Design a protein around this ligand. Structure first.
Ligand SMILES: CCCCCCCC/C=C/CCCCCCCC(=O)O[C@@H](COC(=O)CCCCCCCCCCCCCCC)COP(=O)([O-])OCC[N+](C)(C)C
Ligand SMILES: CCCCCCCC(=O)OC[C@H](COP(=O)(O)O[C@@H]1[C@H](O)[C@H](O)[C@@H](OP(=O)(O)O)[C@H](OP(=O)(O)O)[C@H]1O)OC(=O)CCCCCCC
Ligand SMILES: CCCCCCCCCCCC
Ligand SMILES: CCCCCCCCCCCC
Ligand SMILES: CCCCCCCCCCCC
Ligand SMILES: CCCCCCCC
Ligand SMILES: CCCCCCCC
Ligand SMILES: CCCCCCCC
Ligand SMILES: CCCCCCCC
Lengths: 119, 77
C-alpha cells in the first residue's frame, strides 16, 4: 500500500506515575499508493456512473429500459459503497473515498430522478 | 494489494471494454431506431448496419485479442 519515504528518530523523557523514563522513538514515514484503489474502487465507481448517462441517449419512451438502467445503476452503486466502505475500519467520519462514492451516488440518483421528471 | 496491473487485470480490462462497447453499440443503434413497433409477419425498422457488422467485428476482433493475449503470456520464458 505504502512507500517508505524516510525515517526519523527522537529522544524525550515521558513522565508517568512510577517515575520519569527516557523514551526513544523511531518514526517511519509511509506514503499511500492509490493504484489499487483506482481499479478496485474509483474505476468501477466511475464506469457505473457512465452507465447512468447512457440512459439519456436511450429513448424516453422506453419506460422499462430507462428504469431498468436507472435502478440497476443506482442499486449496484450501493453495493460498491458498502464493499468499498468495508475495506475501511469502523471509524465515525466521512473519508475522501466515502466522499467520492457519495457524489457518484448523487449522479446516479439524479440520473434516475431526471427520467422520473422527464416522463 | 499491489501498485501494478497483473496479466489477469488486462484480460479483465479488455473484456470490460468489449462488454462496455456492446452497450455503446446498442445505444448507437437505439439512436437511429426511428420506429417503436416491430416487424409483423407501413414501414418497419430494417436491421441496422451497426448490428449486421458488429455481429462479425466483435467476435472476430475478440478472437484476435485472445490469440495475442494467450500467445504472448503462454510462451513467455
Ligand atoms: C456459442 C456456443 C453456441 C454455438 C452456436 C452454434 C452456431 C455456430 C455459429 C455459426 C455462425 C453463425 C451464423 C449462422 C447463420 C448464417 C447466417 C449468418 O448470420 O451469417 C452472417 C455472417 O456473420 C456471421 O455468421 C459471424 C458469426 C460469428 C463468427 C465470427 C468470425 C470469427 C470466428 C470466431 C472465432 C474467433 C476468431 C479467432 C480468429 C480466427 C450473415 O448474415 P445474414 O443475415 O445471414 O446475411 C444475409 C444472407 N447473406 C449471407 C447471403 C448475405
Ligand atoms: C461500437 C460503436 C461504433 C461506432 C459506430 C457509429 C457510426 C454510426 O452511427 O453508424 C450508423 C450509420 C447508419 O446505420 P443505421 O443502421 O444504424 O441507421 C440507418 C440509417 O439511418 C438509414 O439511413 C435509415 O434509413 P433511411 O435512409 O433514413 O430511410 C435506417 O432506417 P430504416 O430504413 O430502417 O427505416 C437506419 O436504420 O452508418 C452505417 O450505416 C454504417 C455504420 C457502421 C458501424 C460499424 C462500426 C462497428
Ligand atoms: C452509500 C452512501 C450513500 C450517500 C451518503 C449521503 C450522505 C452525505 C455524504 C457526503 C457528506 C460530505
Ligand atoms: C474494473 C476494471 C476496469 C479496467 C479499466 C477499463 C477501461 C476500459 C473501459 C472503457 C472502454 C470503452
Ligand atoms: C469492436 C470494438 C471492441 C472494443 C474493445 C477493443 C479493445 C482491445 C483491442 C483488441 C486488440 C487486438
Ligand atoms: C420526491 C422524490 C422524487 C420523485 C420524482 C419527482 C419528479 C417531479
Ligand atoms: C454513451 C452514449 C454513446 C453514444 C450514443 C449516441 C450515438 C452517437
Ligand atoms: C470457442 C472455442 C475456442 C477453443 C480454443 C482452443 C483452445 C481451447
Ligand atoms: C479461438 C482462439 C483461442 C486461442 C487459444 C490460445 C492459443 C494459444
Amino acid at each position: 500500500q505504502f512507500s517508505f519515504v524516510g525515517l526519523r528518530n527522537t529522544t524525550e523523557v515521558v513522565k508517568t506515575t512510577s517515575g520519569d523514563y527516557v523514551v526513544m522513538s523511531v518514526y517511519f514515514d509511509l506514503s499511500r499508493r492509490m493504484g489499487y484503489f483506482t481499479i478496485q474502487t474509483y474505476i468501477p465507481c466511475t464506469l457505473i456512473v457512465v452507465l447512468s448517462w447512457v440512459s439519456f441517449w436511450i429513448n424516453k419512451d422506453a419506460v422499462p429500459a430507462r428504469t431498468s438502467l436507472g435502478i440497476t445503476t443506482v442499486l449496484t452503486m450501493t453495493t460498491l459503497s458498502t464493499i468499498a466502505r468495508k475495506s475501511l475500519p469502523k471509524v465515525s467520519y466521512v473519508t475522501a473515498m466515502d466522499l467520492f462514492v457519495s457524489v457518484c451516488f448523487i449522479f446516479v440518483f439524479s440520473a434516475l430522478v431526471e427520467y422520473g421528471t422527464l416522463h | 494489494k499491489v501498485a501494478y496491473a497483473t496479466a489477469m487485470d488486462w484480460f479483465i480490462a479488455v473484456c470490460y471494454a468489449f462488454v462496455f462497447s456492446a452497450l455503446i453499440e446498442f445505444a448507437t443503434v437505439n439512436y437511429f431506431t426511428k420506429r417503436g413497433y416491430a416487424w409483423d409477419g407501413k414501414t418497419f425498422n430494417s436491421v441496422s448496419k451497426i448490428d449486421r457488422l458488429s455481429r462479425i467485428a466483435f467476435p472476430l476482433l475478440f478472437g484476435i485479442f485472445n490469440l495475442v493475449y494467450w500467445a504472448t503470456y503462454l510462451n513467455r520464458e
